[PDB]
Amino acid sequence: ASHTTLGVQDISTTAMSWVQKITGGVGLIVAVAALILIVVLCVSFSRH
Amino acid sequence: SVASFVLLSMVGTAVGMCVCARRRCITPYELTPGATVPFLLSLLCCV
Amino acid sequence: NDCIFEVKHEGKVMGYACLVGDKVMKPAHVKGTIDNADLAKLAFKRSSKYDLECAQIPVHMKSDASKFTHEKPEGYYNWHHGAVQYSGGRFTIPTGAGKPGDSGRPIFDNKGRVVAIVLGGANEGARTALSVVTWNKDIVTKITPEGAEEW
């Protein structure tokens, strides 16, 4: 061959788009659950 | 194979946090004699 | 007379349980078991924030329940060992009345209604202050004076 090899980052644009969508979805549901806990814990502490 | 495992761990954690908040949220109402849980807490939040 | 049950451990009396309204309540820090054979079979829930454990009263004992209120005017109240004066948000007991091992006794109003349970107290010269668990409409709250010790 007349060319060099490819690396781990050298992927198609369509594959990259799918990766971002799946990762973002899971991350969102974690953030929402965390926010619920913080308000409940703070109010219970302060209410006492 | 590895990516699937890690993503499954993230979802399960979110469920566990919700259960912890619910129990600590509601508990005060079960100790008071004659108390009634307000409609909103009974049905919609901290169910 | 009938609303008070003994709590015993290895033959020694550690404290008391009180049957009020529709719930049976026992302080969390007291060790031992319940003398009543039927009550000993119930499941209880624990909360470390208020040092309380509670369960539902079975139907056949409902006729023994005491009455309760939430109104707490300034004035005088009675208990097993004498009078108590309530003023300024604190319950005042003459010094020397009460010793460790006598926790779990209710305080009664003029008409005999339950208003509070005492779980420990502080030591001061002429008069002592108590640490009490009381309630309000739809909530429960705990009051502990500075320097209070468990009884």
From Swiss-Prot, chain A:
Record text on subunit structure and interactions: Interacts with spike glycoprotein E2. The precursor of protein E3/E2 and E1 form a heterodimer shortly after synthesis. Processing of the precursor of protein E3/E2 into E2 and E3 results in a heterodimer of the spike glycoproteins E2 and E1. Spike at virion surface are constituted of three E2-E1 heterodimers. After target cell attachment and endocytosis, E1 change conformation to form homotrimers. Interacts with 6K protein. Interacts with host MXRA8; this interaction mediates virus entry. The interaction involves 2 adjacent E2-E1 heterodimers.
Cytoplasmic side: 46-48
Subcellular location as annotated: Virion membrane; Host cell membrane
Membrane spanning stretches: 25-45
Protein known as: Spike glycoprotein E1
Membrane topology note: Single-pass type I membrane protein
Residues bearing a lipid moiety (S-palmitoyl cysteine): 42
Domain of life (superkingdom): Viruses
Function in brief: Class II viral fusion protein. Fusion activity is inactive as long as E1 is bound to E2 in mature virion. After virus attachment to target cell via host MXRA8 and endocytosis, acidification of the endosome induce dissociation of E1/E2 heterodimer and concomitant trimerization of the E1 subunits. This E1 trimer is fusion active, and promotes release of viral nucleocapsid in cytoplasm after endosome and viral membrane fusion. Efficient fusion requires the presence of cholesterol and sphingolipid in the target membrane.
Lipid attachment locations (S-stearoyl cysteine): 42
Parent-record interval covered: 1201 to 1248 of 1248
Post-translational modification: N-glycosylated.
Curated annotation (Swiss-Prot), chain B:
Protein name (Swiss-Prot/TrEMBL): Spike glycoprotein E2
PTM annotation, UniProt: Palmitoylated via thioester bonds. These palmitoylations may induce disruption of the C-terminus transmembrane. This would result in the reorientation of E2 C-terminus from lumenal to cytoplasmic side. N-glycosylated.
Chain intervals for the UniProt region annotation (Transient transmembrane before p62-6K protein processing): 25-45
Species of origin: Chikungunya virus (strain 37997)
Complex and partners: Interacts with spike glycoprotein E1. Processing of the precursor of protein E3/E2 into E2 and E3 results in a heterodimer of the spike glycoproteins E2 and E1. Spike at virion surface are constituted of a trimer of E2-E1 heterodimers. Interacts with 6K protein. Interacts with host MXRA8; this interaction mediates virus entry. The interaction involves 2 adjacent E2-E1 heterodimers.
Membrane topology: Single-pass type I membrane protein
Disulfides per UniProt: 25-46
Function, in words: Plays a role in viral attachment to target host cell, by binding to the cell receptor MXRA8. Synthesized as a p62 precursor which is processed by furin at the cell membrane just before virion budding, giving rise to E2-E1 heterodimer. The p62-E1 heterodimer is stable, whereas E2-E1 is unstable and dissociate at low pH. p62 is processed at the last step, presumably to avoid E1 fusion activation before its final export to cell surface.
TM region positions: 1-17
Top-rank taxon, per record: Viruses
Residues with lipid group (S-palmitoyl cysteine): 25, 45-46
Residue ranges, annotated region (Interaction with the capsid protein): 20-24
Topological domains, Cytoplasmic: 18-47
Subcellular location: Virion membrane; Host cell membrane
